[PDB]
């Protein structure tokens, strides 16, 4: 169980290093939606329509 939670919180694609140049970077990073990651799209397999 610890391994699963630390996998998700330490090695996930969506668990990213915080952007901290300025407050706007923080707010924008927290309000970001990614179609990539597990269960999502890959960049060499995502067409124009999406």
The reply to whether 9 sits near DNA by the rule CB under 7 A is: no
Judged by CB under 7 A, which of 19, 31, 41, 43 binds DNA? 41
Instruction: Find the angle CA(38)-CA(48)-CA(46) to the nearest 5 degrees.
Output: 20
Q: Does 20 bind DNA (CB under 7 A)?
A: no
**Minimum CB separation from DNA for residue 25, in Å?**
27
Reading the block at residue 5, the tokens are 């939670």
How far is residue 48's CA from residue 34's CA, in Å, rounded to a whole number? Answer: 16
Residues at the site binding DNA, with contacts judged by CB under 7 A: 35, 38-41, 44-47, 49-50
């Amino acid at each position: 169980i610890s391994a699963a939670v630390k996998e998700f919180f330490g090695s996930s694609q969506l668990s990213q290093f915080m952007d901290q140049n300025n407050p706007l970077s923080e707010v924008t990073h927290k309000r970001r939606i990614s179609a990539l990651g597990p269960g999502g799209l890959t960049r060499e397999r995502a067409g124009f329509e999406v």
